[PDB]
């Protein structure tokens, strides 16, 4: 009723608590690491912004922050008897030379009155700032996304700032937050201005992924938060190797996402999650005792039991013939610490400072541990050759770990996080039987509306004719069902006069065809080439 | 002597982008010379090196991308991720204004990277490109 | 290598020989003749198409035993690798993956799945839906475990 | 190039189309549609639990999802979360993305009023301060007690106004805040072209399939095809003078005496004499003035004999003959 008006508002667990004591505790380790790099980035700009006393003293100091994410915020020193202001210029606010000046002079001016306790918004204020506001000026220019701007505007901008170098009560500082590709930037500008730039440049790198000093760190703080109460399987962690390698800019926010979603999967379906604290042994039930039986390492050890002990009268008794000894057989292996966690923490600090190696990934270090490829892991520096015997660990085939583990053995978080998008749509439209289970008898003898043309839509050419496609569409519809369908309702009258018309079938097809190809434009599957002609269209969607 | 024969005004990157995005770049350079009349014959599943680049459309990328990748891949969510990642790097830009380019109206695309940075990034992923450029 | 000796006609007597040994019912046994007659016109190689269709229906008509016995899945393909005298099992699976998408745009298989009620259905509507309560096959399922249990413990005692 | 064309189709009027369309979309596949709707209903507790983690939930899939979102957001979730925190329930702010009249200023002016005006945020209202005003909203919200106070819905996120790039980045900064849950749906096949690793870092999207093969009743309204001129001038002739019917009847006869193209047309002089023959046209001016009315509503064409020809098809003019002229 109201849906054509836009944005109308209206004003209409024993398991989960053990998640709640684990989740936030992990997240205290997350954000405390997040402010560490936040304090790191804010520090290394601040000292380098100051103490650089050049001899010519007629040049601005420039700073190239390579690899930076265009969101790096900056704080400034107080530095009394001089105001220090920050101006940010987003490529959305870069239309010309003119408004790049005019908005920027406006942005400092309100920042100037707020600390001060009619004028014109150009460089007139810059010289008279000594008289307009008393103390001197040191402005800084947070160019947020520098490679999207037309550089001749930027090149003409910096010559305008070059004229401000003759007043001696103002200091200029430029911050170039590039995304990447410093060699691209010295190509675009005028070479007369690069020689203006090259007085005191500083190529500080700011990257979230820099030698994995935080990537290996945040996975390490993940491991102790789940220490001894779970495991991480091999097929799980290689997914974390492969998919996180596909995102260069921000691994660290992504590793929080795919790990915490993985932990959300475990608490939501696994019944033995309650038993990670041994105080919960009183919650034991036969239904819990029944579902413990189908563990693969459980039944395999029983196959190991019979072949080792060909007397099986003991093994048959400890089966479901007893239940007290049966769970006592389980809680024998309950407290398995699995020191692969601790052995990782043993070797992680070692090569960090004993051999002092930094170009390493702790996750595949954990993964090569899971197969036994730690020997073929340390080889890539040839520096643990004196230490491959003391850092050695053979991964033991541990038992009952399949109840306390995380793995994408179901393809869940492969699907629900990285969905094969146009694959799952195209699979939905060719098949349609595994999505959908008086008038439903028609449905068992006639396809749904969107999908029935789709099989011929595959079987059509690159650019297709509209009418012959409908002519082919009329072939798929048999005649007797529609007149059985159009005459199904005796209650309505306005439909029934159309129902008795002898050309109703050929009219109801073009009505139904012009509801489906009407609905293949908002999906972008078919594009109407050369409007006001629309005799032929173009299909972009291919199967792959 | 050493300073008097060099300029020393330039303050060649191996580029930061990932592997599937690297092959995403290596398919985009192909339509600087490969016209639609020739490409589907020479890239079956069964010179303008100097000249200014031609104009893309969408899905011609994935036409070439699916061919030249090492059935081994089908999920294209991260492939769609690195496109607008490459759009923010201004290495492939829109012909029109920078606004409506998402929904498939008439939007043409084009590379903005010279040949040498393509040539290093070909060997950086061990892929051979100079075969398919033939005057 | 009879499969690579191409361009030979499988007549009406010949094709019903090829399906009465694999125990096909009369519903599909006429349909194989019906869709070969569809594909006798637009073919490329007659040996490859005639075997690719007979495997996936036996994958779907015998799945009440195939999902309940994993060993017979090699049995049905190897008895055709001996019948068609193939090279190995490498090329035959390359056929059945090929023609499966080539029959996914037709009518009768979308009937034959929902007529046979065979699939399992409630898994796929929970797998494709992205359900957190879907089955994770790190486990062996309770039925197959009980199939494993009653086979072994009666072998035991 | 003998092509069958949409002009050569048995056409259907306005009331005839929409009624029989309404018959199908409410009686075609009704039983399996709610049968799907009961199956996906068990996923509703799973969405409630993940949404406490501030996850931007995104729904893809074929078919319209508009009915499904409004059941899931309004009736199910929004009172369930208010009961589980402990009074009016949680305010729902939908965004109709299929409505092209959505701007960035107006919806955010709703947002800061939907959110708390604890400070004088109109002081920071200054000239694009929108990203400025939301940045002062974000850092304050980093140190607040974690509870959802608002859930917003964005239908058809690839819509004609929401897909604009200055609006997209605006929603990106909203999603990093923990106090608001972002449940949106798109329909495009190229929807993941919209986001890079910068925005999805702010978004942390997760995905779920919903495919009910809905007809998109509301979403078909703004869209148009040639159903929505031969049909345009079909109504003007129903309200004119009675003489214009006759002088168009004499026009349409000899213009269909010979598709309706240029070559079947007639010269101006003889047509003046022909409409002088039936005591209709006095002269050229009285002919042309009530022929400019057929020109002003683009009901006839002229090219060069001095050929005036009707731009409608061969099939259309005899339909115009036997129905409205007769």
Coordinates of N, CA and C in Angstrom, one line a residue, chain A residues 158-326:
Chain A
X158 N 49.4 22.7 -6.3 CA 50.6 22.8 -5.4 C 51.4 24.0 -5.8
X159 N 51.2 24.5 -7.0 CA 51.9 25.7 -7.4 C 51.2 26.9 -6.8
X160 N 49.9 26.8 -6.5 CA 49.2 27.8 -5.7 C 49.7 27.8 -4.3
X161 N 50.1 26.7 -3.7 CA 50.6 26.6 -2.4 C 52.1 27.1 -2.4
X162 N 52.7 27.1 -3.5 CA 54.1 27.5 -3.6 C 54.2 29.0 -3.4
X163 N 53.2 29.8 -3.8 CA 53.2 31.2 -3.6 C 53.1 31.6 -2.1
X164 N 52.7 30.7 -1.2 CA 52.5 31.0 0.2 C 53.9 31.0 0.9
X165 N 55.0 30.8 0.2 CA 56.3 30.5 0.9 C 57.0 31.8 1.2
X166 N 56.4 32.9 1.2 CA 57.1 34.2 1.4 C 56.6 35.0 2.5
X167 N 56.0 34.4 3.5 CA 55.4 35.1 4.6 C 56.0 34.7 6.0
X168 N 56.6 33.5 6.0 CA 57.6 33.1 7.0 C 56.9 32.8 8.4
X169 N 55.7 33.1 8.5 CA 54.9 32.8 9.8 C 54.0 31.6 9.6
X170 N 54.1 30.9 8.5 CA 53.3 29.7 8.2 C 54.1 28.6 7.7
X171 N 53.7 27.4 8.2 CA 54.5 26.2 7.8 C 53.5 25.2 7.1
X172 N 53.9 24.6 6.0 CA 53.1 23.7 5.2 C 53.6 22.3 5.4
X173 N 52.7 21.4 5.4 CA 53.0 19.9 5.5 C 52.0 19.2 4.7
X174 N 52.5 18.3 3.8 CA 51.6 17.5 2.9 C 51.7 16.0 3.3
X175 N 50.5 15.4 3.3 CA 50.4 14.0 3.6 C 49.8 13.3 2.4
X176 N 50.5 12.4 1.7 CA 50.0 11.8 0.5 C 49.6 10.3 0.9
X177 N 48.3 10.1 1.2 CA 47.8 8.8 1.5 C 47.6 8.1 0.1
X178 N 48.6 7.5 -0.5 CA 48.4 6.8 -1.7 C 47.8 5.4 -1.3
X179 N 47.2 4.8 -2.3 CA 46.8 3.4 -2.1 C 48.0 2.5 -2.3
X180 N 48.7 2.7 -3.4 CA 49.9 2.0 -3.7 C 50.6 2.7 -4.9
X181 N 51.7 2.1 -5.4 CA 52.2 2.4 -6.7 C 52.8 3.8 -6.8
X182 N 53.9 4.0 -6.0 CA 54.6 5.2 -6.0 C 55.2 5.6 -7.4
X183 N 55.6 4.5 -8.1 CA 56.2 4.8 -9.5 C 55.1 5.3 -10.4
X184 N 53.8 5.0 -10.2 CA 52.7 5.6 -11.0 C 52.6 7.1 -10.7
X185 N 52.9 7.5 -9.5 CA 52.6 8.9 -9.2 C 53.6 9.9 -9.7
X186 N 54.9 9.4 -9.8 CA 55.9 10.3 -10.4 C 55.8 10.3 -12.0
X187 N 55.0 9.5 -12.5 CA 54.6 9.5 -13.9 C 53.6 10.6 -14.3
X188 N 52.6 10.8 -13.4 CA 51.4 11.6 -13.7 C 51.7 13.1 -13.5
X189 N 52.5 13.5 -12.6 CA 52.6 14.9 -12.3 C 53.5 15.6 -13.3
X190 N 53.6 16.9 -13.3 CA 54.6 17.6 -14.0 C 55.9 17.5 -13.4
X191 N 57.0 17.3 -14.2 CA 58.3 17.1 -13.7 C 58.9 18.3 -13.0
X192 N 58.4 19.5 -13.3 CA 58.8 20.7 -12.6 C 58.4 20.7 -11.2
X193 N 57.3 20.0 -10.9 CA 56.8 19.9 -9.5 C 57.3 18.8 -8.7
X194 N 57.8 17.7 -9.4 CA 58.5 16.7 -8.7 C 59.8 17.2 -8.1
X195 N 60.5 18.0 -8.8 CA 61.7 18.7 -8.3 C 61.3 19.6 -7.2
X196 N 60.1 20.2 -7.2 CA 59.6 20.9 -6.0 C 59.3 19.9 -4.9
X197 N 58.8 18.7 -5.2 CA 58.5 17.7 -4.2 C 59.7 17.1 -3.6
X198 N 60.8 17.0 -4.3 CA 61.9 16.1 -3.9 C 62.9 16.8 -2.9
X199 N 62.5 17.8 -2.2 CA 63.3 18.5 -1.2 C 63.5 17.6 0.0
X200 N 62.5 17.4 0.8 CA 62.6 16.5 1.9 C 61.4 15.5 1.9
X201 N 61.5 14.4 1.2 CA 60.5 13.4 1.1 C 60.9 12.3 2.1
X202 N 59.8 11.6 2.5 CA 60.0 10.5 3.4 C 59.0 9.4 3.0
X203 N 59.5 8.2 2.6 CA 58.7 7.1 2.1 C 58.4 6.1 3.3
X204 N 57.6 6.6 4.2 CA 57.2 5.7 5.3 C 56.2 4.7 4.8
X205 N 56.4 3.5 5.0 CA 55.4 2.4 4.7 C 54.4 2.3 5.9
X206 N 53.1 2.3 5.5 CA 52.0 1.9 6.5 C 51.2 0.9 5.8
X207 N 51.3 -0.3 6.2 CA 50.5 -1.4 5.7 C 50.1 -2.3 6.9
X208 N 48.8 -2.8 6.8 CA 48.3 -3.7 7.8 C 49.1 -5.0 7.7
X209 N 49.4 -5.4 6.5 CA 50.2 -6.6 6.2 C 51.6 -6.2 5.9
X210 N 52.5 -6.1 6.9 CA 53.9 -5.8 6.7 C 54.8 -6.8 7.4
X211 N 55.2 -7.9 6.7 CA 55.9 -9.0 7.3 C 55.2 -9.8 8.3
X212 N 53.9 -9.7 8.3 CA 52.9 -10.4 9.1 C 53.2 -10.2 10.6
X213 N 53.6 -9.0 11.0 CA 53.8 -8.8 12.4 C 52.5 -8.7 13.2
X214 N 51.4 -8.5 12.6 CA 50.1 -8.6 13.3 C 49.3 -9.7 12.8
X215 N 49.4 -10.2 11.6 CA 48.7 -11.3 11.1 C 49.0 -12.6 11.8
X216 N 50.3 -12.9 12.0 CA 50.8 -14.0 12.8 C 50.4 -13.7 14.3
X217 N 50.3 -12.5 14.7 CA 50.0 -12.1 16.1 C 48.6 -12.4 16.4
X218 N 47.6 -12.1 15.5 CA 46.2 -12.2 15.9 C 45.8 -13.6 15.8
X219 N 46.4 -14.4 15.0 CA 46.1 -15.9 14.9 C 46.7 -16.5 16.2
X220 N 47.8 -16.0 16.7 CA 48.4 -16.5 17.9 C 47.5 -16.3 19.1
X221 N 47.0 -15.1 19.2 CA 46.1 -14.8 20.3 C 44.7 -15.5 20.1
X222 N 44.4 -15.9 18.9 CA 43.3 -16.8 18.7 C 43.5 -18.1 19.4
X223 N 44.7 -18.6 19.3 CA 45.0 -20.0 19.7 C 44.9 -20.2 21.2
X224 N 45.4 -19.2 22.0 CA 45.3 -19.4 23.4 C 43.9 -19.2 23.9
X225 N 43.1 -18.4 23.2 CA 41.7 -18.2 23.6 C 40.9 -19.5 23.5
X226 N 41.3 -20.4 22.6 CA 40.7 -21.7 22.4 C 41.6 -22.8 22.8
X227 N 42.5 -22.6 23.7 CA 43.6 -23.5 24.0 C 43.0 -24.7 24.8
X228 N 43.3 -25.9 24.2 CA 43.0 -27.2 24.9 C 41.5 -27.6 24.8
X229 N 40.6 -26.7 24.5 CA 39.2 -27.0 24.5 C 38.7 -27.3 23.1
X230 N 39.5 -27.3 22.0 CA 39.1 -27.5 20.7 C 40.3 -27.9 19.9
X231 N 40.2 -28.0 18.5 CA 41.3 -28.3 17.6 C 41.0 -27.5 16.4
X232 N 41.9 -27.4 15.5 CA 41.7 -26.8 14.2 C 42.2 -27.8 13.1
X233 N 41.3 -28.2 12.3 CA 41.7 -29.3 11.3 C 42.4 -28.7 10.1
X234 N 43.0 -29.7 9.4 CA 43.8 -29.3 8.3 C 43.1 -28.7 7.1
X235 N 41.9 -29.2 6.8 CA 41.1 -28.6 5.7 C 40.6 -27.3 6.1
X236 N 40.4 -27.0 7.3 CA 39.9 -25.7 7.8 C 41.0 -24.7 7.5
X237 N 42.3 -25.0 7.9 CA 43.3 -23.9 8.0 C 43.8 -23.6 6.6
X238 N 43.7 -24.5 5.7 CA 44.2 -24.2 4.3 C 43.2 -23.3 3.6
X239 N 41.9 -23.4 4.0 CA 41.0 -22.4 3.6 C 41.4 -21.0 4.1
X240 N 41.9 -20.9 5.3 CA 42.4 -19.7 5.9 C 43.7 -19.2 5.2
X241 N 44.4 -20.2 4.7 CA 45.6 -19.9 3.9 C 45.2 -19.3 2.5
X242 N 44.3 -20.0 1.9 CA 44.0 -19.7 0.5 C 43.2 -18.4 0.4
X243 N 42.1 -18.3 1.1 CA 41.1 -17.2 0.9 C 41.7 -15.9 1.5
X244 N 42.4 -15.9 2.6 CA 43.0 -14.7 3.1 C 44.1 -14.2 2.2
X245 N 44.7 -15.1 1.4 CA 45.7 -14.7 0.4 C 45.1 -13.9 -0.7
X246 N 43.8 -14.0 -0.9 CA 43.1 -13.3 -2.0 C 42.8 -11.8 -1.6
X247 N 43.1 -11.4 -0.4 CA 42.7 -10.0 0.0 C 44.0 -9.4 0.7
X248 N 44.6 -8.6 -0.1 CA 46.0 -8.1 0.3 C 45.8 -6.9 1.3
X249 N 44.8 -6.1 1.2 CA 44.8 -4.8 1.9 C 44.5 -5.0 3.4
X250 N 43.5 -5.8 3.7 CA 43.0 -6.0 5.1 C 42.8 -7.5 5.3
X251 N 43.9 -8.1 5.7 CA 43.8 -9.5 6.2 C 43.2 -9.5 7.6
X252 N 43.6 -8.5 8.4 CA 43.4 -8.6 9.9 C 41.9 -8.5 10.2
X253 N 41.2 -7.6 9.5 CA 39.7 -7.6 9.7 C 39.0 -8.8 9.2
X254 N 39.6 -9.4 8.2 CA 39.0 -10.6 7.6 C 39.2 -11.8 8.4
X255 N 40.4 -12.0 9.1 CA 40.7 -13.1 9.9 C 39.8 -13.1 11.2
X256 N 39.4 -11.9 11.6 CA 38.5 -11.8 12.7 C 37.1 -12.3 12.2
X257 N 36.8 -12.1 11.0 CA 35.4 -12.4 10.5 C 35.3 -13.9 10.3
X258 N 36.2 -14.5 9.6 CA 36.0 -15.9 9.2 C 36.3 -16.8 10.4
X259 N 37.1 -16.4 11.4 CA 37.3 -17.2 12.5 C 36.1 -17.2 13.5
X260 N 35.6 -16.0 13.7 CA 34.5 -15.8 14.7 C 33.2 -16.4 14.1
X261 N 33.0 -16.4 12.8 CA 31.9 -17.1 12.2 C 32.1 -18.6 12.3
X262 N 33.3 -19.1 12.2 CA 33.6 -20.5 12.4 C 33.3 -20.9 13.8
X263 N 33.6 -20.1 14.8 CA 33.3 -20.4 16.2 C 31.8 -20.4 16.4
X264 N 31.1 -19.5 15.7 CA 29.6 -19.5 15.8 C 29.0 -20.7 15.3
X265 N 29.6 -21.4 14.4 CA 29.1 -22.7 13.8 C 29.2 -23.8 14.9
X266 N 30.3 -23.8 15.7 CA 30.5 -24.9 16.6 C 29.5 -24.9 17.7
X267 N 29.3 -23.7 18.3 CA 28.3 -23.6 19.4 C 26.9 -23.8 19.0
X268 N 26.6 -23.8 17.7 CA 25.2 -23.8 17.3 C 24.7 -25.2 16.9
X269 N 25.6 -26.2 16.8 CA 25.1 -27.5 16.4 C 25.7 -28.6 17.2
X270 N 26.9 -28.4 17.8 CA 27.5 -29.5 18.5 C 27.1 -29.6 19.9
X271 N 26.7 -30.8 20.3 CA 26.1 -31.1 21.6 C 27.2 -31.2 22.7
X272 N 28.4 -31.6 22.3 CA 29.5 -31.8 23.2 C 30.2 -30.6 23.5
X273 N 29.7 -29.4 23.1 CA 30.3 -28.1 23.4 C 30.2 -27.8 24.9
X274 N 29.2 -28.4 25.6 CA 29.0 -28.2 27.0 C 30.1 -28.8 27.9
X275 N 30.8 -29.9 27.3 CA 31.7 -30.7 28.1 C 33.1 -30.2 28.0
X276 N 33.3 -29.0 27.5 CA 34.7 -28.4 27.5 C 35.1 -27.9 28.8
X277 N 34.1 -27.8 29.8 CA 34.5 -27.6 31.2 C 34.0 -28.9 31.8
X278 N 34.9 -29.6 32.6 CA 34.5 -30.9 33.2 C 33.5 -30.8 34.3
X279 N 33.1 -29.6 34.7 CA 32.1 -29.4 35.7 C 30.7 -29.9 35.2
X280 N 30.5 -29.9 33.9 CA 29.3 -30.2 33.2 C 29.1 -31.7 33.0
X281 N 29.7 -32.5 33.8 CA 29.5 -34.0 33.6 C 28.2 -34.5 34.1
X282 N 27.5 -33.7 34.9 CA 26.2 -34.1 35.4 C 25.1 -33.9 34.4
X283 N 25.3 -33.1 33.3 CA 24.4 -32.9 32.2 C 24.4 -34.1 31.2
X284 N 25.1 -35.2 31.6 CA 25.2 -36.3 30.7 C 23.9 -37.1 30.6
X285 N 23.6 -37.6 29.4 CA 22.3 -38.2 29.1 C 22.6 -39.4 28.1
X286 N 21.6 -40.3 28.0 CA 21.7 -41.3 27.0 C 21.6 -40.8 25.6
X287 N 20.9 -39.7 25.4 CA 20.9 -39.1 24.1 C 22.3 -38.5 23.7
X288 N 23.0 -37.9 24.7 CA 24.3 -37.6 24.5 C 25.2 -38.8 24.4
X289 N 24.9 -39.9 25.1 CA 25.6 -41.1 25.0 C 25.4 -41.8 23.7
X290 N 24.2 -41.6 23.1 CA 24.0 -42.3 21.8 C 24.8 -41.6 20.7
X291 N 24.8 -40.2 20.7 CA 25.4 -39.5 19.6 C 26.9 -39.5 19.7
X292 N 27.5 -40.0 20.8 CA 29.0 -40.1 20.9 C 29.5 -41.2 20.1
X293 N 28.6 -42.2 19.8 CA 29.0 -43.4 19.1 C 29.4 -43.2 17.7
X294 N 28.8 -42.3 17.0 CA 29.1 -42.1 15.5 C 30.4 -41.3 15.3
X295 N 31.2 -41.1 16.2 CA 32.5 -40.4 16.0 C 33.4 -41.3 15.2
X296 N 34.1 -40.8 14.2 CA 35.0 -41.6 13.4 C 36.2 -42.2 14.1
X297 N 36.8 -41.4 15.0 CA 37.9 -41.9 15.7 C 37.5 -42.8 16.8
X298 N 36.2 -42.7 17.2 CA 35.7 -43.7 18.2 C 35.6 -45.1 17.6
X299 N 34.9 -45.2 16.5 CA 34.6 -46.5 15.8 C 35.9 -47.1 15.3
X300 N 36.9 -46.2 14.8 CA 38.1 -46.7 14.3 C 39.0 -47.3 15.3
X301 N 39.0 -46.7 16.5 CA 39.7 -47.3 17.6 C 39.1 -48.6 18.1
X302 N 37.8 -48.8 18.0 CA 37.2 -50.1 18.2 C 37.7 -51.1 17.2
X303 N 37.8 -50.7 15.9 CA 38.4 -51.5 14.9 C 39.9 -51.7 15.2
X304 N 40.5 -50.7 15.9 CA 41.9 -51.0 16.4 C 41.8 -51.9 17.6
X305 N 40.7 -51.9 18.4 CA 40.6 -52.7 19.6 C 40.5 -54.1 19.3
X306 N 39.7 -54.5 18.3 CA 39.5 -55.9 18.0 C 40.7 -56.6 17.4
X307 N 41.4 -55.9 16.5 CA 42.6 -56.5 15.9 C 43.7 -56.6 16.9
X308 N 43.9 -55.6 17.8 CA 44.9 -55.7 18.8 C 44.5 -56.7 19.9
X309 N 43.3 -56.6 20.4 CA 42.8 -57.6 21.3 C 41.8 -58.5 20.6
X310 N 42.2 -59.6 20.0 CA 41.3 -60.6 19.5 C 40.4 -61.2 20.5
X311 N 40.7 -61.3 21.8 CA 39.7 -61.3 22.8 C 38.8 -60.0 22.8
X312 N 37.5 -60.2 22.5 CA 36.7 -59.0 22.4 C 35.6 -58.9 23.5
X313 N 35.7 -59.8 24.5 CA 34.7 -59.8 25.5 C 34.8 -58.6 26.4
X314 N 36.0 -58.1 26.6 CA 36.2 -56.8 27.3 C 35.7 -55.7 26.4
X315 N 35.9 -55.7 25.1 CA 35.6 -54.7 24.2 C 34.1 -54.6 24.0
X316 N 33.4 -55.8 24.0 CA 32.0 -55.8 23.9 C 31.3 -55.3 25.2
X317 N 32.0 -55.6 26.3 CA 31.4 -55.1 27.6 C 31.5 -53.6 27.7
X318 N 32.6 -53.0 27.3 CA 32.7 -51.5 27.3 C 31.9 -50.8 26.2
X319 N 31.3 -51.6 25.4 CA 30.3 -51.0 24.4 C 29.0 -50.8 25.1
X320 N 27.9 -50.6 24.4 CA 26.6 -50.2 25.0 C 26.0 -51.2 25.9
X321 N 26.6 -52.4 26.1 CA 26.2 -53.3 27.2 C 26.3 -52.6 28.5
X322 N 27.4 -51.9 28.8 CA 27.5 -51.0 29.9 C 27.3 -49.6 29.5
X323 N 27.0 -48.7 30.4 CA 26.9 -47.3 30.2 C 27.8 -46.5 31.1
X324 N 28.0 -47.0 32.3 CA 28.9 -46.3 33.3 C 30.3 -46.4 32.9
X325 N 30.8 -47.6 32.5 CA 32.1 -47.8 31.9 C 32.2 -47.2 30.5
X326 N 31.1 -47.1 29.8 CA 31.1 -46.6 28.5 C 31.5 -45.1 28.4

